[PDB]
Amino acid sequence: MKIGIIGAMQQEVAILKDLIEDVQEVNQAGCTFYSGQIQGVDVVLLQSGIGKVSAALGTALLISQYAPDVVINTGSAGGFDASLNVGDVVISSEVRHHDADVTAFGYEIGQMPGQPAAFKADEKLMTVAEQALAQLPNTHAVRGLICTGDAFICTAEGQQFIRQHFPSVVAVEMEASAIAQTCHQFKVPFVVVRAISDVADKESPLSFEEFLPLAAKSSSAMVLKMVELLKENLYFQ
Amino acid sequence: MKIGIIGAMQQEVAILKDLIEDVQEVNQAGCTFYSGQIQGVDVVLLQSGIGKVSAALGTALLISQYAPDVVINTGSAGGFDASLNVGDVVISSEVRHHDADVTAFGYEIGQMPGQPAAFKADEKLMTVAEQALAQLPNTHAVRGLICTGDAFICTAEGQQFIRQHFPSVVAVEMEASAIAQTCHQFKVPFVVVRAISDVADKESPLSFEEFLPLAAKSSSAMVLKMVELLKENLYFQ
Numbered sequence: 001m002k003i004g005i006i007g008a009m010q011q012e013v014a015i016l017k018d019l020i021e022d023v024q025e026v027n028q029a030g031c032t033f034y035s036g037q038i039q040g041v042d043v044v045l046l047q048s049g050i051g052k053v054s055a056a057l058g059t060a061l062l063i064s065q066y067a068p069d070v071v072i073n074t075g076s077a078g079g080f081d082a083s084l085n086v087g088d089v090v091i092s093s094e095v096r097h098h099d100a101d102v103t104a105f106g107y108e109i110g111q112m113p114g115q116p117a118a119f120k121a122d123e124k125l126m127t128v129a130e131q132a133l134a135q136l137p138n139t140h141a142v143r144g145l146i147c148t149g150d151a152f153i154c155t156a157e158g159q160q161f162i163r164q165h166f167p168s169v170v171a172v173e174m175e176a177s178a179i180a181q182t183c184h185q186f187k188v189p190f191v192v193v194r195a196i197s198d199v200a201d202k203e204s205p206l207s208f209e210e211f212l213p214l215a216a217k218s219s220s221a222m223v224l225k226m227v228e229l230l231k232e233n234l235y236f237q
Numbered sequence: 238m239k240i241g242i243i244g245a246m247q248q249e250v251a252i253l254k255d256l257i258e259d260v261q262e263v264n265q266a267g268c269t270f271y272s273g274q275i276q277g278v279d280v281v282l283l284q285s286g287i288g289k290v291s292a293a294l295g296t297a298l299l300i301s302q303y304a305p306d307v308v309i310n311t312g313s314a315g316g317f318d319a320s321l322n323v324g325d326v327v328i329s330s331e332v333r334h335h336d337a338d339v340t341a342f343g344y345e346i347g348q349m350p351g352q353p354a355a356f357k358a359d360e361k362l363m364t365v366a367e368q369a370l371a372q373l374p375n376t377h378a379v380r381g382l383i384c385t386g387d388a389f390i391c392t393a394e395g396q397q398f399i400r401q402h403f404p405s406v407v408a409v410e411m412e413a414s415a416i417a418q419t420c421h422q423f424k425v426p427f428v429v430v431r432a433i434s435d436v437a438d439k440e441s442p443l444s445f446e447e448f449l450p451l452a453a454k455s456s457s458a459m460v461l462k463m464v465e466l467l468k469e470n471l472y473f474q
């Protein structure tokens with residue numbers, strides 16, 4: 001099997017990049033693809049750049065050229081769920097665009113015409129995420145709705161808008177819905193396994209830069225554990 | 238040369254689709270690609286679907302698989318310039334994301350990290366659009382900033398925010414910045430040549446329904462003239 005792993009920033013992909021054996025690097029359209037193996041499992045790690053367009057473009061190139069069997073989105077996120085602390089893992093049940101609005105034509109808030117209102121994480125991948133979490137007993141996680149937009153959320157007004165429209169939101173970021181929508185269009189299973197760098201408030205610019213490395217560490221540990229589980233999930237393969 | 242043409246909706250691509258000789262249709266990832274010739278020049282017409290993610294995904298597949306020499310984005314738009322009536326044409330000087338905001342890290346409003354603040358349309362393609370306009374004297378057009386977001390703009394608040402942050406905006410729509418950013422990442426020249434279906438206000442939903450066909454007609458006539466000029470002029474090898 002081949003696992004596609006996608007992160008936006010260099011800092012988000014660095015830990016996993018260093019684990020790829022027999023690594024081959026391709027640079028294309030602002031994207032970097034690292035292909036090789038982890039523990040005999042074929043992996044392609046994409047560093048896409050930030051935001052919905054970069055993530056969509058990168059994901060489209062990843063799927064069309066490398067044909068991963070599954071996609072895992074790694075990286076940081078801004079926490080909305082009360083129970084999340086900085087460094088904690090967040091897992092997508094589903095992903096929505098918080099900044100999509102075609103309600104004028106009867107679509108629900110966040111729904112892009114032509115798409116479902118939410119992009120559901122693959123149930124079989126989800127089971128692997130749960131298994132990985134069970135093997136990291138020091139790790140606290142929350143699973144729920146992840147909301148994506150092309151904005152860094154750092155104001156009370158920004159938070160309130162998102163909570164008003166998506167009351168179940170557990171975290172926000174800037175790529176997941178683009179990765180998930182792209183995967184939906186290609187019919188490829190995905191899950192988002194990120195970790196919290198900040199709580200999307202006026203302190204988040206500073207918190208983000210301070211704790212991005214921690215978030216990358218936590219997210220990356222989970223993703224590595226999933227790769228190790230996938231290695232011997234022969235029914236899944 | 239090979240000319241790439243991108244429209245989001247069925248009605249936006251239908252006029253040009255019907256002019257393609259020796260047409261070959263490919264369906265991939267929810268996109269449709271029609272290739273062949275229009276008046277003796279190779280074209281690939283992409284029906285991308287609506288919104289930034291679909292447009293980015295589609296444009297990435299278009300460029301990576303078909304290698305068009307230039308990209309023209311056709312279709313409808315919501316008018317901001319006071320002189321625009323339904324059916325009038327807008328030509329991009331440049332394109333920006335109206336809904337991007339990472340000002341917390343020093344970027345300009347609308348600027349995505351890792352990108353320039355605006356995506357400038359190609360000078361030769363703008364010239365060709367202006368030549369096409371001269372050959373369609375009963376068409377009124379404005380050249381200027383086109384702003385894109387994942388929302389249908391139809392409220393006073395929506396207009397206010399966009400005008401506040403991008404006061405020179407001439408029109409808004411939902412794909413151009415995705416196309417433009419993707420073309421930027423691939424280093425492929427682009428221009429947007431759209432037409433007005435509505436003026437982005439409370440009347441827009443009904444105006445759009447009524448005037449989408451007029452907007453497709455007006456935009457498509459310009460694009461056809463541009464195809465003819467590009468075949469003749471050798472501006473692009």
Ligand SMILES: CSC[C@H]1CN(Cc2c[nH]c3c(N)ncnc23)C[C@@H]1O
Binds near residue numbers: 051077154197198201
């Ligand atoms: C330099 S732009 C920030 C990057 C890291 N991202 C995830 C993220 C963490 N905190 C966030 C917040 N408060 N709002 C939105 N996104 C995030 C998204 C982008 O790649």
Ligand SMILES: CSC[C@H]1CN(Cc2c[nH]c3c(N)ncnc23)C[C@@H]1O
Binds near residue numbers: 105315391411434
């Ligand atoms: C059914 S969604 C609208 C489709 C047609 N589009 C262009 C457009 C016309 N008027 C617009 C407006 N007031 N606000 C944003 N976009 C537009 C974008 C989308 O593909």
